[PDB]
mmCIF file of C-alpha atoms in Angstrom:
data_model
loop_
_atom_site.group_PDB
_atom_site.id
_atom_site.type_symbol
_atom_site.label_atom_id
_atom_site.label_comp_id
_atom_site.label_asym_id
_atom_site.label_seq_id
_atom_site.Cartn_x
_atom_site.Cartn_y
_atom_site.Cartn_z
ATOM 1 C CA UNK M 1 27.222 27.484 12.015
ATOM 2 C CA UNK M 2 26.221 27.554 15.682
ATOM 3 C CA UNK M 3 22.602 26.411 15.483
ATOM 4 C CA UNK M 4 23.745 23.699 13.091
ATOM 5 C CA UNK M 5 26.246 22.570 15.732
ATOM 6 C CA UNK M 6 23.551 22.139 18.383
ATOM 7 C CA UNK M 7 21.186 20.457 15.918
ATOM 8 C CA UNK M 8 23.806 17.864 14.994
ATOM 9 C CA UNK M 9 24.656 17.405 18.679
ATOM 10 C CA UNK M 10 21.029 16.632 19.553
ATOM 11 C CA UNK M 11 20.677 14.289 16.579
ATOM 12 C CA UNK M 12 23.744 12.357 17.727
ATOM 13 C CA UNK M 13 22.471 12.462 21.309
ATOM 14 C CA UNK M 14 19.397 10.547 20.143
ATOM 15 C CA UNK M 15 21.708 7.849 18.782
ATOM 16 C CA UNK M 16 22.558 6.646 22.287
ATOM 17 C CA UNK M 17 20.373 3.690 23.255
ATOM 18 C CA UNK M 18 20.825 3.574 27.032
ATOM 19 C CA UNK M 19 19.124 1.432 29.677
ATOM 20 C CA UNK M 20 19.561 1.873 33.432
ATOM 21 C CA UNK M 21 19.118 -1.679 34.724
ATOM 22 C CA UNK M 22 18.648 -0.813 38.400
ATOM 23 C CA UNK M 23 17.882 2.905 38.642
ATOM 24 C CA UNK M 24 14.260 3.774 37.693
ATOM 25 C CA UNK M 25 14.763 7.483 38.436
ATOM 26 C CA UNK M 26 17.755 7.840 36.111
ATOM 27 C CA UNK M 27 16.004 5.730 33.478
ATOM 28 C CA UNK M 28 12.912 7.955 33.440
ATOM 29 C CA UNK M 29 15.109 11.055 33.419
ATOM 30 C CA UNK M 30 17.080 9.746 30.441
ATOM 31 C CA UNK M 31 14.006 8.687 28.451
ATOM 32 C CA UNK M 32 12.454 12.113 29.041
ATOM 33 C CA UNK M 33 15.557 13.913 27.783
ATOM 34 C CA UNK M 34 15.432 11.988 24.508
ATOM 35 C CA UNK M 35 11.666 12.481 24.229
ATOM 36 C CA UNK M 36 12.130 16.213 24.773
ATOM 37 C CA UNK M 37 15.057 16.394 22.345
ATOM 38 C CA UNK M 38 13.053 14.638 19.634
ATOM 39 C CA UNK M 39 10.051 16.888 20.273
ATOM 40 C CA UNK M 40 12.263 19.979 20.047
ATOM 41 C CA UNK M 41 13.768 18.948 16.711
ATOM 42 C CA UNK M 42 10.347 18.004 15.334
ATOM 43 C CA UNK M 43 8.992 21.479 16.095
ATOM 44 C CA UNK M 44 12.274 23.021 14.945
ATOM 45 C CA UNK M 45 12.511 21.374 11.521
ATOM 46 C CA UNK M 46 8.776 21.886 10.959
ATOM 47 C CA UNK M 47 8.268 25.603 11.551
ATOM 48 C CA UNK M 48 11.743 27.078 10.986
ATOM 49 C CA UNK M 49 12.892 27.933 7.457
ATOM 50 C CA UNK M 50 16.294 27.042 5.975
ATOM 51 C CA UNK M 51 17.461 24.842 8.851
ATOM 52 C CA UNK M 52 18.130 21.724 6.793
ATOM 53 C CA UNK M 53 21.705 22.186 5.598
ATOM 54 C CA UNK M 54 23.915 19.652 3.814
ATOM 55 C CA UNK M 55 25.715 18.389 6.951
ATOM 56 C CA UNK M 56 22.300 17.647 8.495
ATOM 57 C CA UNK M 57 21.376 14.916 5.987
ATOM 58 C CA UNK M 58 23.874 12.249 7.080
ATOM 59 C CA UNK M 59 22.997 12.932 10.727
ATOM 60 C CA UNK M 60 19.229 12.561 10.343
ATOM 61 C CA UNK M 61 19.456 9.385 8.258
ATOM 62 C CA UNK M 62 21.910 7.875 10.748
ATOM 63 C CA UNK M 63 19.758 8.765 13.757
ATOM 64 C CA UNK M 64 16.749 7.166 12.064
ATOM 65 C CA UNK M 65 18.714 4.041 11.134
ATOM 66 C CA UNK M 66 20.177 3.522 14.612
ATOM 67 C CA UNK M 67 16.769 3.958 16.258
ATOM 68 C CA UNK M 68 14.425 2.189 13.842
ATOM 69 C CA UNK M 69 16.387 -0.518 12.013
ATOM 70 C CA UNK M 70 16.076 -3.131 14.754
ATOM 71 C CA UNK M 71 14.843 -6.702 15.191
ATOM 72 C CA UNK M 72 11.097 -7.290 15.552
ATOM 73 C CA UNK M 73 9.757 -9.385 18.468
ATOM 74 C CA UNK M 74 7.322 -12.216 17.598
ATOM 75 C CA UNK M 75 6.463 -2.122 20.875
ATOM 76 C CA UNK M 76 6.753 -0.675 24.383
ATOM 77 C CA UNK M 77 9.149 2.150 23.526
ATOM 78 C CA UNK M 78 6.646 3.444 20.968
ATOM 79 C CA UNK M 79 6.532 7.043 22.301
ATOM 80 C CA UNK M 80 10.166 7.446 21.209
ATOM 81 C CA UNK M 81 9.696 5.503 17.969
ATOM 82 C CA UNK M 82 6.692 7.591 16.914
ATOM 83 C CA UNK M 83 8.710 10.773 17.453
ATOM 84 C CA UNK M 84 11.519 9.432 15.269
ATOM 85 C CA UNK M 85 8.977 8.538 12.577
ATOM 86 C CA UNK M 86 7.348 11.970 12.769
ATOM 87 C CA UNK M 87 10.694 13.788 12.697
ATOM 88 C CA UNK M 88 11.996 11.863 9.690
ATOM 89 C CA UNK M 89 8.659 12.480 7.984
ATOM 90 C CA UNK M 90 8.914 16.244 8.520
ATOM 91 C CA UNK M 91 12.444 15.910 7.155
ATOM 92 C CA UNK M 92 11.319 14.419 3.838
ATOM 93 C CA UNK M 93 8.234 16.627 3.490
ATOM 94 C CA UNK M 94 10.173 19.847 4.098
ATOM 95 C CA UNK M 95 10.337 22.395 1.242
ATOM 96 C CA UNK M 96 14.065 22.763 1.966
ATOM 97 C CA UNK M 97 14.616 19.022 1.526
ATOM 98 C CA UNK M 98 16.870 18.319 -1.460
ATOM 99 C CA UNK M 99 16.832 14.736 -2.844
ATOM 100 C CA UNK M 100 20.038 15.461 -4.778
ATOM 101 C CA UNK M 101 21.953 15.551 -1.492
ATOM 102 C CA UNK M 102 19.860 12.990 0.383
ATOM 103 C CA UNK M 103 20.180 10.257 -2.254
ATOM 104 C CA UNK M 104 23.751 9.699 -1.068
ATOM 105 C CA UNK M 105 22.547 8.451 2.317
ATOM 106 C CA UNK M 106 19.045 7.209 1.515
ATOM 107 C CA UNK M 107 20.183 4.279 -0.623
ATOM 108 C CA UNK M 108 19.041 0.746 -1.468
ATOM 109 C CA UNK M 109 20.227 -0.750 1.825
ATOM 110 C CA UNK M 110 18.215 1.907 3.662
ATOM 111 C CA UNK M 111 15.127 1.128 1.575
ATOM 112 C CA UNK M 112 15.659 -2.594 2.156
ATOM 113 C CA UNK M 113 15.809 -2.225 5.942
ATOM 114 C CA UNK M 114 12.793 0.083 5.807
ATOM 115 C CA UNK M 115 10.816 -2.603 3.972
ATOM 116 C CA UNK M 116 11.762 -5.248 6.539
ATOM 117 C CA UNK M 117 10.014 -3.123 9.164
ATOM 118 C CA UNK M 118 6.714 -3.521 7.301
ATOM 119 C CA UNK M 119 6.476 -6.944 8.945
ATOM 120 C CA UNK M 120 5.815 -5.195 12.263
ATOM 121 C CA UNK M 121 2.783 -6.364 14.235
ATOM 122 C CA UNK M 122 2.087 -2.766 15.255
ATOM 123 C CA UNK M 123 -0.549 -1.160 12.976
ATOM 124 C CA UNK M 124 0.638 2.308 14.006
ATOM 125 C CA UNK M 125 4.197 1.552 12.897
ATOM 126 C CA UNK M 126 3.151 0.113 9.531
ATOM 127 C CA UNK M 127 1.120 3.284 8.987
ATOM 128 C CA UNK M 128 4.188 5.477 9.505
ATOM 129 C CA UNK M 129 6.194 3.196 7.217
ATOM 130 C CA UNK M 130 3.494 3.379 4.553
ATOM 131 C CA UNK M 131 3.661 7.176 4.544
ATOM 132 C CA UNK M 132 7.465 7.258 4.640
ATOM 133 C CA UNK M 133 8.080 4.824 1.772
ATOM 134 C CA UNK M 134 5.424 6.595 -0.299
ATOM 135 C CA UNK M 135 7.358 9.831 0.182
ATOM 136 C CA UNK M 136 10.735 8.253 -0.582
ATOM 137 C CA UNK M 137 9.350 6.703 -3.771
ATOM 138 C CA UNK M 138 8.065 10.028 -5.088
ATOM 139 C CA UNK M 139 11.144 12.021 -4.089
ATOM 140 C CA UNK M 140 13.770 9.520 -5.255
ATOM 141 C CA UNK M 141 13.413 8.621 -8.932
ATOM 142 C CA UNK M 142 16.571 6.509 -8.828
ATOM 143 C CA UNK M 143 15.051 4.257 -6.172
ATOM 144 C CA UNK M 144 11.647 3.636 -7.769
ATOM 145 C CA UNK M 145 12.803 0.634 -9.805
ATOM 146 C CA UNK M 146 14.466 -1.004 -6.800
ATOM 147 C CA UNK M 147 11.417 -0.407 -4.601
ATOM 148 C CA UNK M 148 9.001 -2.038 -7.056
ATOM 149 C CA UNK M 149 11.221 -5.105 -7.440
ATOM 150 C CA UNK M 150 11.614 -5.579 -3.688
ATOM 151 C CA UNK M 151 7.877 -5.175 -3.095
ATOM 152 C CA UNK M 152 7.403 -7.710 -5.891
ATOM 153 C CA UNK M 153 9.817 -10.081 -4.145
ATOM 154 C CA UNK M 154 7.868 -9.795 -0.886
ATOM 155 C CA UNK M 155 4.594 -10.674 -2.620
ATOM 156 C CA UNK M 156 6.062 -13.665 -4.478
ATOM 157 C CA UNK M 157 7.422 -14.845 -1.132
ATOM 158 C CA UNK M 158 3.975 -14.250 0.383
ATOM 159 C CA UNK M 159 2.074 -16.181 -2.289
ATOM 160 C CA UNK M 160 4.100 -19.044 -3.747
ATOM 161 C CA UNK M 161 6.529 -19.453 -0.846
ATOM 162 C CA UNK M 162 5.128 -19.590 2.688
ATOM 163 C CA UNK M 163 6.369 -16.402 4.352
ATOM 164 C CA UNK M 164 3.545 -14.694 6.235
ATOM 165 C CA UNK M 165 3.548 -10.892 6.121
ATOM 166 C CA UNK M 166 1.729 -8.295 8.235
ATOM 167 C CA UNK M 167 2.156 -5.333 5.900
ATOM 168 C CA UNK M 168 0.643 -6.638 2.662
ATOM 169 C CA UNK M 169 -2.246 -4.185 2.985
ATOM 170 C CA UNK M 170 -0.013 -1.171 3.637
ATOM 171 C CA UNK M 171 2.247 -2.098 0.713
ATOM 172 C CA UNK M 172 -0.733 -2.467 -1.636
ATOM 173 C CA UNK M 173 -1.952 0.985 -0.608
ATOM 174 C CA UNK M 174 1.395 2.429 -1.706
ATOM 175 C CA UNK M 175 1.171 0.651 -5.062
ATOM 176 C CA UNK M 176 -2.298 2.099 -5.589
ATOM 177 C CA UNK M 177 -0.722 5.546 -5.538
ATOM 178 C CA UNK M 178 1.881 4.390 -8.054
ATOM 179 C CA UNK M 179 -0.563 2.683 -10.428
ATOM 180 C CA UNK M 180 -2.785 5.777 -10.559
ATOM 181 C CA UNK M 181 0.147 7.798 -11.893
ATOM 182 C CA UNK M 182 1.312 5.437 -14.643
ATOM 183 C CA UNK M 183 2.460 6.725 -18.047
ATOM 184 C CA UNK M 184 0.145 6.931 -21.059
ATOM 185 C CA UNK M 185 0.956 3.517 -22.546
ATOM 186 C CA UNK M 186 1.466 0.946 -19.769
ATOM 187 C CA UNK M 187 4.874 -0.736 -19.668
ATOM 188 C CA UNK M 188 5.175 -4.508 -19.943
ATOM 189 C CA UNK M 189 6.566 -4.975 -16.432
ATOM 190 C CA UNK M 190 3.418 -3.323 -15.075
ATOM 191 C CA UNK M 191 1.084 -5.640 -16.984
ATOM 192 C CA UNK M 192 3.152 -8.629 -15.861
ATOM 193 C CA UNK M 193 2.911 -7.433 -12.256
ATOM 194 C CA UNK M 194 -0.876 -7.295 -12.569
ATOM 195 C CA UNK M 195 -1.225 -10.762 -14.090
ATOM 196 C CA UNK M 196 1.569 -12.635 -12.312
ATOM 197 C CA UNK M 197 1.389 -11.026 -8.860
ATOM 198 C CA UNK M 198 -1.757 -9.010 -8.090
ATOM 199 C CA UNK M 199 -4.220 -11.627 -9.345
ATOM 200 C CA UNK M 200 -2.684 -14.657 -7.571
ATOM 201 C CA UNK M 201 -2.998 -12.630 -4.342
ATOM 202 C CA UNK M 202 -6.674 -13.623 -4.352
ATOM 203 C CA UNK M 203 -5.644 -17.236 -3.707
ATOM 204 C CA UNK M 204 -4.208 -16.653 -0.226
ATOM 205 C CA UNK M 205 -6.566 -17.604 2.609
ATOM 206 C CA UNK M 206 -5.707 -14.401 4.485
ATOM 207 C CA UNK M 207 -7.222 -12.352 1.648
ATOM 208 C CA UNK M 208 -9.688 -10.763 4.085
ATOM 209 C CA UNK M 209 -6.910 -8.676 5.646
ATOM 210 C CA UNK M 210 -5.817 -6.831 2.499
ATOM 211 C CA UNK M 211 -8.691 -7.361 0.045
ATOM 212 C CA UNK M 212 -9.956 -3.747 -0.073
ATOM 213 C CA UNK M 213 -6.482 -2.529 -1.063
ATOM 214 C CA UNK M 214 -6.009 -5.369 -3.551
ATOM 215 C CA UNK M 215 -9.311 -4.531 -5.240
ATOM 216 C CA UNK M 216 -8.308 -0.875 -5.596
ATOM 217 C CA UNK M 217 -5.076 -1.818 -7.375
ATOM 218 C CA UNK M 218 -6.973 -4.055 -9.801
ATOM 219 C CA UNK M 219 -9.548 -1.357 -10.578
ATOM 220 C CA UNK M 220 -6.936 1.374 -11.061
ATOM 221 C CA UNK M 221 -5.171 -0.924 -13.526
ATOM 222 C CA UNK M 222 -8.338 -1.196 -15.616
ATOM 223 C CA UNK M 223 -8.870 2.572 -15.555
ATOM 224 C CA UNK M 224 -5.435 2.907 -17.149
ATOM 225 C CA UNK M 225 -5.734 0.168 -19.768
ATOM 226 C CA UNK M 226 -9.180 -1.329 -20.365
ATOM 227 C CA UNK M 227 -7.560 -4.063 -22.473
ATOM 228 C CA UNK M 228 -6.481 -5.924 -19.335
ATOM 229 C CA UNK M 229 -10.013 -6.551 -18.059
ATOM 230 C CA UNK M 230 -10.560 -9.956 -19.691
ATOM 231 C CA UNK M 231 -7.685 -11.823 -18.031
ATOM 232 C CA UNK M 232 -8.530 -9.990 -14.794
ATOM 233 C CA UNK M 233 -12.201 -10.995 -14.673
ATOM 234 C CA UNK M 234 -11.519 -14.559 -15.831
ATOM 235 C CA UNK M 235 -8.818 -14.975 -13.181
ATOM 236 C CA UNK M 236 -11.180 -13.489 -10.601
ATOM 237 C CA UNK M 237 -13.737 -16.113 -11.622
ATOM 238 C CA UNK M 238 -11.049 -18.794 -11.377
ATOM 239 C CA UNK M 239 -10.052 -17.785 -7.848
ATOM 240 C CA UNK M 240 -13.750 -17.493 -6.981
ATOM 241 C CA UNK M 241 -14.666 -19.463 -3.817
ATOM 242 C CA UNK M 242 -16.028 -22.760 -5.167
ATOM 243 C CA UNK M 243 -17.027 -23.654 -1.621
ATOM 244 C CA UNK M 244 -19.996 -21.374 -0.918
ATOM 245 C CA UNK M 245 -18.540 -19.053 1.713
ATOM 246 C CA UNK M 246 -19.209 -15.526 3.069
ATOM 247 C CA UNK M 247 -15.877 -14.685 1.403
ATOM 248 C CA UNK M 248 -17.906 -14.465 -1.817
ATOM 249 C CA UNK M 249 -19.139 -11.037 -0.708
ATOM 250 C CA UNK M 250 -15.596 -9.709 -1.104
ATOM 251 C CA UNK M 251 -15.367 -11.052 -4.652
ATOM 252 C CA UNK M 252 -18.833 -9.639 -5.350
ATOM 253 C CA UNK M 253 -17.727 -6.251 -4.007
ATOM 254 C CA UNK M 254 -14.591 -6.306 -6.155
ATOM 255 C CA UNK M 255 -16.570 -7.453 -9.194
ATOM 256 C CA UNK M 256 -19.084 -4.598 -9.010
ATOM 257 C CA UNK M 257 -16.260 -2.082 -8.582
ATOM 258 C CA UNK M 258 -14.743 -3.517 -11.765
ATOM 259 C CA UNK M 259 -18.068 -3.246 -13.608
ATOM 260 C CA UNK M 260 -18.334 0.422 -12.608
ATOM 261 C CA UNK M 261 -15.246 1.179 -14.704
ATOM 262 C CA UNK M 262 -15.640 -1.364 -17.507
ATOM 263 C CA UNK M 263 -16.015 -0.596 -21.220
ATOM 264 C CA UNK M 264 -19.026 -1.926 -23.209
ATOM 265 C CA UNK M 265 -16.809 -3.649 -25.794
ATOM 266 C CA UNK M 266 -14.966 -5.235 -22.877
ATOM 267 C CA UNK M 267 -18.196 -6.080 -21.062
ATOM 268 C CA UNK M 268 -19.459 -8.408 -23.797
ATOM 269 C CA UNK M 269 -16.169 -10.323 -23.719
ATOM 270 C CA UNK M 270 -16.812 -11.742 -20.246
ATOM 271 C CA UNK M 271 -20.498 -11.081 -19.531
ATOM 272 C CA UNK M 272 -21.575 -14.695 -20.049
ATOM 273 C CA UNK M 273 -19.172 -16.443 -17.662
ATOM 274 C CA UNK M 274 -19.660 -13.584 -15.185
ATOM 275 C CA UNK M 275 -23.456 -13.712 -14.991
ATOM 276 C CA UNK M 276 -23.361 -17.511 -14.849
ATOM 277 C CA UNK M 277 -21.405 -17.057 -11.629
ATOM 278 C CA UNK M 278 -23.691 -14.220 -10.540
ATOM 279 C CA UNK M 279 -26.672 -16.507 -11.131
ATOM 280 C CA UNK M 280 -25.110 -19.076 -8.803
ATOM 281 C CA UNK M 281 -24.719 -16.365 -6.163
ATOM 282 C CA UNK M 282 -28.409 -15.449 -6.312
ATOM 283 C CA UNK M 283 -29.220 -19.142 -5.839
ATOM 284 C CA UNK M 284 -26.787 -19.390 -2.914
ATOM 285 C CA UNK M 285 -27.774 -21.119 0.356
ATOM 286 C CA UNK M 286 -26.083 -18.238 2.182
ATOM 287 C CA UNK M 287 -28.451 -15.267 2.350
ATOM 288 C CA UNK M 288 -25.616 -12.733 2.622
ATOM 289 C CA UNK M 289 -24.154 -13.862 -0.704
ATOM 290 C CA UNK M 290 -27.555 -13.691 -2.398
ATOM 291 C CA UNK M 291 -28.322 -10.293 -0.865
ATOM 292 C CA UNK M 292 -25.042 -8.897 -2.189
ATOM 293 C CA UNK M 293 -25.496 -10.340 -5.680
ATOM 294 C CA UNK M 294 -29.083 -9.081 -5.920
ATOM 295 C CA UNK M 295 -27.836 -5.569 -5.155
ATOM 296 C CA UNK M 296 -26.246 -5.538 -8.620
ATOM 297 C CA UNK M 297 -29.601 -4.580 -10.140
ATOM 298 C CA UNK M 298 -29.466 -1.282 -8.235
ATOM 299 C CA UNK M 299 -26.308 -0.284 -10.108
ATOM 300 C CA UNK M 300 -27.675 1.916 -12.894
ATOM 301 C CA UNK M 301 -24.609 1.574 -15.122
ATOM 302 C CA UNK M 302 -24.764 -2.223 -14.942
ATOM 303 C CA UNK M 303 -28.444 -2.123 -15.915
ATOM 304 C CA UNK M 304 -27.562 -0.183 -19.070
ATOM 305 C CA UNK M 305 -24.952 -2.834 -19.870
ATOM 306 C CA UNK M 306 -27.520 -5.560 -19.224
ATOM 307 C CA UNK M 307 -30.240 -3.836 -21.261
ATOM 308 C CA UNK M 308 -27.839 -3.562 -24.202
ATOM 309 C CA UNK M 309 -27.169 -7.299 -23.915
ATOM 310 C CA UNK M 310 -30.451 -8.609 -22.494
ATOM 311 C CA UNK M 311 -30.708 -11.196 -25.277
ATOM 312 C CA UNK M 312 -27.717 -13.054 -23.822
ATOM 313 C CA UNK M 313 -27.809 -12.143 -20.125
ATOM 314 C CA UNK M 314 -31.498 -12.482 -19.200
ATOM 315 C CA UNK M 315 -31.692 -16.151 -20.253
ATOM 316 C CA UNK M 316 -28.805 -16.804 -17.841
ATOM 317 C CA UNK M 317 -30.265 -15.031 -14.808
ATOM 318 C CA UNK M 318 -33.840 -16.213 -15.391
ATOM 319 C CA UNK M 319 -33.756 -19.544 -17.305
ATOM 320 C CA UNK M 320 -37.409 -20.433 -16.654
ATOM 321 C CA UNK M 321 -38.520 -17.061 -18.028
ATOM 322 C CA UNK M 322 -36.237 -16.578 -21.032
ATOM 323 C CA UNK M 323 -34.441 -18.723 -23.610
ATOM 324 C CA UNK M 324 -31.923 -18.392 -26.442
ATOM 325 C CA UNK C 1 -7.663 10.119 2.833
ATOM 326 C CA UNK C 2 -5.694 8.127 0.250
ATOM 327 C CA UNK C 3 -2.048 8.663 -0.669
ATOM 328 C CA UNK C 4 -1.450 11.317 -3.326
ATOM 329 C CA UNK C 5 -0.776 9.823 -6.795
ATOM 330 C CA UNK C 6 2.861 9.427 -7.845
ATOM 331 C CA UNK C 7 3.313 10.450 -11.519
ATOM 332 C CA UNK C 8 5.482 7.941 -13.391
ATOM 333 C CA UNK C 9 8.683 9.372 -14.866
ATOM 334 C CA UNK C 10 11.415 8.029 -17.201
ATOM 335 C CA UNK C 11 13.726 5.783 -15.174
#
């Protein structure tokens, strides 16, 4: 076409990474042109219908790759980077977007380089990456298996290896969306992922950074299959901070969220070792830990579980008042 | 808000 010609021209124009070393006026002029070009195409692909044709796909993916797939410093050109993120996001979210054509260019190497950007120290960038990968996962069925494995590899390298990662939280938030949409009978690889990966994540000392997201994944797993709650709770009690620390509040938060979605038949399977730990928390030297544990009695659903099993639980919580 | 759930499909 003719509009298609100009669109492709502007996309390729944003593939030129220039830098005027000693001419501030020309540098600002150049950076503005690219900023304007990106802004134009963002508005264009967003509000105009039937503008994404087949020749556009290899151009957009290339422009994204050239601009984003870089090396992270241990940014400053974020205004341009955010535009690229927003444009590529409008590209995927468009009603005219056809995965059948795009899967030729959005391949495993693209997904791999996209995942390597999750190690960015910029929270804004990881947020754009979280949204993008979530969209790619849902729109590309043939990539879902590869994505899960690579995310799995990053976690294993974060836990048992030594590689520090800055996007563990953002990655866990993506998984939460995936877990919530699992098939009726959970596959074995999913159960393995819960037991061999998600649970040992509680061991890492930097748990505080990604704990809310980790807890959500664990809970969503139990809402799918309540059978998995016994190895989950027992492992949670294993990884429980032996050294009385304010980090106990996180475990207490996660534990109550688990109890809010637990089955009665599953409750009696782990109620004794749980409330023995809970009893220790009420007797804690740290007030914050005791305050959090005592708040369990306010949970009306837990009370019903306790009342149904008061003969076994009450002697644990109040030894000088009750016996077996 | 959270990310919209992704329904699992045969792979």
